[PDB]
Design an enzyme around this catalytic site. Sequence first.
Site, PDB file in Angstrom:
ATOM      1  N   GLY A  15       0.789  -1.213   0.000  1.00 41.63           N
ATOM      2  CA  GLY A  15       0.000   0.000   0.000  1.00 41.63           C
ATOM      3  C   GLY A  15       0.825   1.269   0.000  1.00 41.63           C
ATOM      4  O   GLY A  15       2.049   1.231   0.013  1.00 41.63           O
ATOM      5  N   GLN A  18       2.446   7.375   4.627  1.00 43.46           N
ATOM      6  CA  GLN A  18       2.656   8.828   4.735  1.00 43.46           C
ATOM      7  C   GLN A  18       3.968   9.329   4.133  1.00 43.46           C
ATOM      8  O   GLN A  18       4.005  10.389   3.543  1.00 43.46           O
ATOM      9  CB  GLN A  18       2.584   9.279   6.207  1.00 43.46           C
ATOM     10  N   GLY A  20       6.032   7.197   2.192  1.00 42.68           N
ATOM     11  CA  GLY A  20       6.384   6.383   1.012  1.00 42.68           C
ATOM     12  C   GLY A  20       5.631   5.072   1.000  1.00 42.68           C
ATOM     13  O   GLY A  20       4.895   4.761   1.950  1.00 42.68           O
ATOM     14  N   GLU A  86       5.481  -5.698  11.969  1.00 40.57           N
ATOM     15  CA  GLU A  86       4.620  -6.837  11.860  1.00 40.57           C
ATOM     16  C   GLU A  86       3.744  -6.696  10.601  1.00 40.57           C
ATOM     17  O   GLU A  86       3.245  -5.614  10.298  1.00 40.57           O
ATOM     18  CB  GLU A  86       3.771  -6.942  13.134  1.00 40.57           C
ATOM     19  N   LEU A  87       3.583  -7.787   9.865  1.00 39.78           N
ATOM     20  CA  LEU A  87       2.755  -7.798   8.680  1.00 39.78           C
ATOM     21  C   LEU A  87       1.306  -8.124   9.050  1.00 39.78           C
ATOM     22  O   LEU A  87       1.038  -9.144   9.681  1.00 39.78           O
ATOM     23  CB  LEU A  87       3.273  -8.833   7.661  1.00 39.78           C
ATOM     24  N   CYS A  88       0.391  -7.264   8.624  1.00 32.21           N
ATOM     25  CA  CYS A  88      -1.031  -7.473   8.749  1.00 32.21           C
ATOM     26  C   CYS A  88      -1.523  -7.814   7.359  1.00 32.21           C
ATOM     27  O   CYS A  88      -1.668  -6.926   6.516  1.00 32.21           O
ATOM     28  CB  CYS A  88      -1.705  -6.211   9.270  1.00 32.21           C
ATOM     29  N   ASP A 132      -4.534  11.253  15.361  1.00 34.67           N
ATOM     30  CA  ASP A 132      -4.868  10.916  13.968  1.00 34.67           C
ATOM     31  C   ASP A 132      -5.596   9.569  13.881  1.00 34.67           C
ATOM     32  O   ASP A 132      -5.174   8.650  13.157  1.00 34.67           O
ATOM     33  CB  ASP A 132      -3.591  10.938  13.117  1.00 34.67           C
ATOM     34  N   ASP A 150      -0.483   3.026  12.641  1.00 31.66           N
ATOM     35  CA  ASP A 150       0.290   4.203  12.234  1.00 31.66           C
ATOM     36  C   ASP A 150       0.286   5.209  13.358  1.00 31.66           C
ATOM     37  O   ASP A 150      -0.756   5.447  13.942  1.00 31.66           O
ATOM     38  CB  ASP A 150      -0.324   4.823  10.975  1.00 31.66           C
TER      39      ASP A 150
END
Lengths: 255, 256
Positions: A15, A18, A20, A86-88, A132, A150
């Site tokens: 994806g 912010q 890159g 960590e990969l989601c 945010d 994030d």
Amino acid sequence: YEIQRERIELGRCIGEGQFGDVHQGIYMSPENPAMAVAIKTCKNCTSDSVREKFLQEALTMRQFDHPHIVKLIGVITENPVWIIMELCTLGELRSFLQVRKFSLDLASLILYAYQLSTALAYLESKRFVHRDIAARNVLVSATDCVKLGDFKLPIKWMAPESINFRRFTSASDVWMFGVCMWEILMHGVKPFQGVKNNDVIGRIENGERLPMPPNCPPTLYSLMTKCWAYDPSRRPRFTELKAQLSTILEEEKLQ
Amino acid sequence: DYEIQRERIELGRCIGEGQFGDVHQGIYMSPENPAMAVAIKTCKNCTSDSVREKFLQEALTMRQFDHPHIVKLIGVITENPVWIIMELCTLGELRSFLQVRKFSLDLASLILYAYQLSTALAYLESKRFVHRDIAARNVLVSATDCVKLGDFGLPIKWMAPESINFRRFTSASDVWMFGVCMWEILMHGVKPFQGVKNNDVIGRIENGERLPMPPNCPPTLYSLMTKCWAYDPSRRPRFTELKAQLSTILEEEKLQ
């Protein structure tokens, strides 16, 4: 937390981010020869000011340990600078909700709101203000598990005091969380579509609020409304939200 | 000048098969600068000298250009089989990218892509270069916020009426095709005139019919497309004007 570049195999872009693009990858680690990871990249990391801001996220993420907050794995602090997390595997929450709009039941949507409330109650317990909170900053780890992901202004999410005076507090986080709940129950539609950012504050001051999403339980919309009290001192805290969301979720599962 | 030795190239996976040649990913190890990811287009052994020449011409054409939204030529291997070595756009073809990531691509991204392509086309117009095949199929994606024109060489559904009627291609006919390309972008990679016969397109154009406004397309942007599709080529805008207008439309969307 420093990871040698040679231990990372950069894979597919998953994806935007912010600073890159965010990629999936493999971390060939001593603890695990093929750990699937997410890799955040930073365009203009050759700029000291940008690099500093980018890496500050890693430092922030490292302070927290919660099941519904993404974990930091490491950093590469030579150009090109990378954050390894960590990969989601199911990706961004907004796209997930839009794609699975007619596959996701109400109970799942309420679950995601509840899970985020647990994360935010934890951050409140540490006196940390996020500033945010929005569906765009949530990631999906499994069909039954979301994580805060994030750590120019998102006017359409902001409490009135944030827009007027740039005050961000635990109370303004609750306002934003109300908007995030709305977004979830709308299957990832943005708030105030078709309204210019500059006209948002005027409607809020006039007492206008995002309307009840189709099929939203009245109890849940009421909770959203409480988050959008104009006076910040009248807004609930996350302990209360979490407790109420748990009841609402269980009610819905009893259906 | 642009010749590279085959030993300097490591051929990787095929990322696009083709009639007279295929497209591959690979690695270039330059004597000055190791090591570089690249795109490799390969000519088949059985391809005619005429079509081989087109491969070399594509590289020759690309080497004339230096723009951030145009793919760079790295070099060529002139010994048969011919390979053309180009900058690698890692997210691949724009159409596939738009279709697959439809629900991750908001309107500001779609407008950005149109704007970026307009800057590439304004630059080509500044060189008096006529492209003749502007279409989403010929755009590559270098990052989620960066697209590049990637190819310089029968697309009736994209062509200006004078190109269909007369095989006339000019800077003005490029603008027509760009309007179609914008439409494709705003449609998340849907082809124009889906389920329509090529031989029917011109009949519909001369009757005044145009591709419809895409859902969520701002009216000001669709008005731009409709200007691109003026039947009279002399009434079409040039790319300098399209670039300026697209910058305004992009800023307006960002204010939301």
